Amino acid sequence: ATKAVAVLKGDGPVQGIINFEQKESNGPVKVWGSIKGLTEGLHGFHVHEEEDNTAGCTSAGPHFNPLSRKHGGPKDEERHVGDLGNVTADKDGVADVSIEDSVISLSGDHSIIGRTLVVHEKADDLGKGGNEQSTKTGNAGSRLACGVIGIAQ
Ligand SMILES: [Cl-]
Ligand SMILES: [Cl-]
Ligand SMILES: [Cu+2]
Ligand SMILES: [Zn+2]
Numbered sequence: 001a002t003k004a005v006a007v008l009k010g011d012g013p014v015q016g017i018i019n020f021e022q023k024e025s026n027g028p029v030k031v032w033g034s035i036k037g038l039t040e041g042l043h044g045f046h047v048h049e050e051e052d053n054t055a056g057c058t059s060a061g062p063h064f065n066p067l068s069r070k071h072g073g074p075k076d077e078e079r080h081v082g083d084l085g086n087v088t089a090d091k092d093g094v095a096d097v098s099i100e101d102s103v104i105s106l107s108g109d110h111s112i113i114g115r116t117l118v119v120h121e122k123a124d125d126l127g128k129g130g131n132e133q134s135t136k137t138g139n140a141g142s143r144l145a146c147g148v149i150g151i152a153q
Contacts, residue, residue, distance in 0.1 A: 002106040003152035006117040010057060010145035013037030018097055018117060020149065025107040031084070031099040035119055035145070038089035044124035044140025045097070047082030047104065047149070050116040057146035060118050063137065066110045070135045073126035074101060081110060083138075086124050095119075118146045 004020040016035035022028070035043075049061035063071065064082035072079030081103050089095040104112050124138035133139055 004106060004113055004149050005152050006147040006149045008035060008117060008119060008145040008147045010143070012144060013093075014119060014145040016095075016097075016119075016145070018147075019152075020106065020112075022106040026105070028100050028102050029104045029106060029112075031097055031101065033097045035087065035089070035095045035097065036093055038093045038095055038119070038144070039121075040089055040091050040093070042086040042088055042123035043095065043144070044118075044120035044122065044138055045084045045087045046080070046118055046120075046124070046140075047084065047112050048116045048118050048146070049082075051114045057116075057118060057143035060116045060143055060146050064112065064115050071127040071138050073124070073128075074099070074103075076127060079103065079127070081112070082115070083124075085126065087119065112149050113151060115149055116146050117149055118143050120144060 014037040018033040047064040063080040087095040120140035122141035
């Protein structure tokens with residue numbers, strides 16, 4: 001099995017430790033953890049393209065999209081590799097992550113290891129919104145916290 005961790009931080013109170021595990025090189029990836037410091041409600045949660053050693057969430061980039069597809073929710077056939085949907089924060093600002101995904105991988109040509117995990121200010125509209133930007137970013141707005149997805153040490 002391969003394991004990774006992303007430590008989310010930003011310029012504000014949003015932070016958390018996100019774990020990844022992939023038991024087989026072409027098997028599902030499981031993702032879990034908690035994020036604190038969020039406003040109550042849905043927040044977009046994606047793997048972004050950025051893999052340079054830029055300062056925090058200044059150049060997270062577009063979504064990680066090695067197959068040059070349109071934005072969707074995680075269950076949509078047409079989606080970015082990085083499209084992990086939304087997390088939901090409660091009234092005290094904590095969102096629990098619990099995702100099983102078939103599209104991301106920790107291995108091979110399109111590994112997400114080294115890419116940037118991002119949690120957003122607003123909800124992801126899952127590509128179902130009324131503008132072209134829905135089909136790019138889901139209109140999830142600003143990056144509140146980000147971290148490099150690194151192999152577990
Ligand atoms: Cl925003
Ligand atoms: Cl803004
Ligand atoms: Cu994102
Ligand atoms: Zn996307």
